[PDB]
Amino acid sequence: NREIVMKYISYKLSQRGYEWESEVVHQTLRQAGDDFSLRYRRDFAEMSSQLHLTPGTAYASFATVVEELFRDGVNWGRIVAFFEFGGVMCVESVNREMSVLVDNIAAWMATYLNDHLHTWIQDNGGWDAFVELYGNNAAAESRKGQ
Ligand SMILES: COc1cc2c(cc1[C@H](CN1CCCC1)c1ccc(-c3ccc(C(=O)NS(=O)(=O)c4ccc(N[C@H](CCN5CCOCC5)CSc5ccccc5)c(S(=O)(=O)C(F)(F)F)c4)cc3)cc1)OCO2
């Protein structure tokens, strides 16, 4: 998926004011990402406090985090974490006057989605099943998985 990436990044860049599947998939993913960033605010803040970003290290940083994220397997919340992480990297790139990196990060994200998440997503009911899970309350999400 690639539109999904560009629409996400464009939105995260907006929440900081900086200009760069059905609509309900894109809205739900935005909403789930915002949820993630609130619930894991310490990790978001730690990441910001400890991210050391240059164009020369940007790929290593991107690839290292993503590899740790999915090391024990894929699930929908880690896919949300993936989008949020890339969005933050793009935000931090623009903040540090390295805006060149945004297109690179978008490409890396789209490539990771296509090459390493597409199979899992298809096998787990597609983005339609993501939206279904988001709608269900915590108790109902555990029941559906079980
Ligand atoms: C390297 O790891 C990273 C990378 C990071 C990062 C944080 C991490 C850390 C690593 N830390 C730091 C060092 C090692 C430990 C991290 C890595 C992973 C996670 C994590 C935490 C929880 C889950 C998890 O619950 N996944 S889950 O079961 O599939 C799930 C549960 C609830 C939900 N949605 C629920 C929606 C509730 N609805 C209920 C009814 O009305 C509307 C809302 C709960 S909201 C939520 C959103 C995202 C993630 C977790 C909870 C979802 S979802 O929103 O994706 C949906 F499918 F529903 F659409 C998935 C998955 C991953 C948390 C933190 O920040 C961005 O970059």
Swiss-Prot record:
BH1 and BH2 domains are required for the interaction with BAX and for anti-apoptotic activity. It is found in: Mitochondrion outer membrane; Nucleus membrane; Endoplasmic reticulum membrane; Cytoplasm. The chain holds residues 11 to 203 of 239 of the full protein. A motif (BH4) lies at residues 1-20. One of its GO terms (biological process) is response to ischemia. One of its GO terms (cellular component) is membrane. Suppresses apoptosis in a variety of cell systems including factor-dependent lymphohematopoietic and neural cells. Regulates cell death by controlling the mitochondrial membrane permeability. Appears to function in a feedback loop system with caspases. Inhibits caspase activity either by preventing the release of cytochrome c from the mitochondria and/or by binding to the apoptosis-activating factor (APAF-1). Also acts as an inhibitor of autophagy: interacts with BECN1 and AMBRA1 during non-starvation conditions and inhibits their autophagy function. Expressed in a variety of tissues. Changing residue 123 to A: No effect on BAX-binding, nor on anti-apoptotic activity. Partial loss of BAX-binding and 50% decrease in anti-apoptotic activity. No effect on homodimerization. It comes from Homo sapiens. Changing residue 122 to L: Partial loss of BAX-binding and 50% decrease in anti-apoptotic activity. No effect on homodimerization. This is Apoptosis regulator Bcl-2. In the absence of growth factors, BCL2 appears to be phosphorylated by other protein kinases such as ERKs and stress-activated kinases. Dephosphorylated by protein phosphatase 2A (PP2A). Proteolytically cleaved by caspases during apoptosis. The cleaved protein, lacking the BH4 motif, has pro-apoptotic activity, causes the release of cytochrome c into the cytosol promoting further caspase activity. A motif (BH1) lies at residues 68-87.
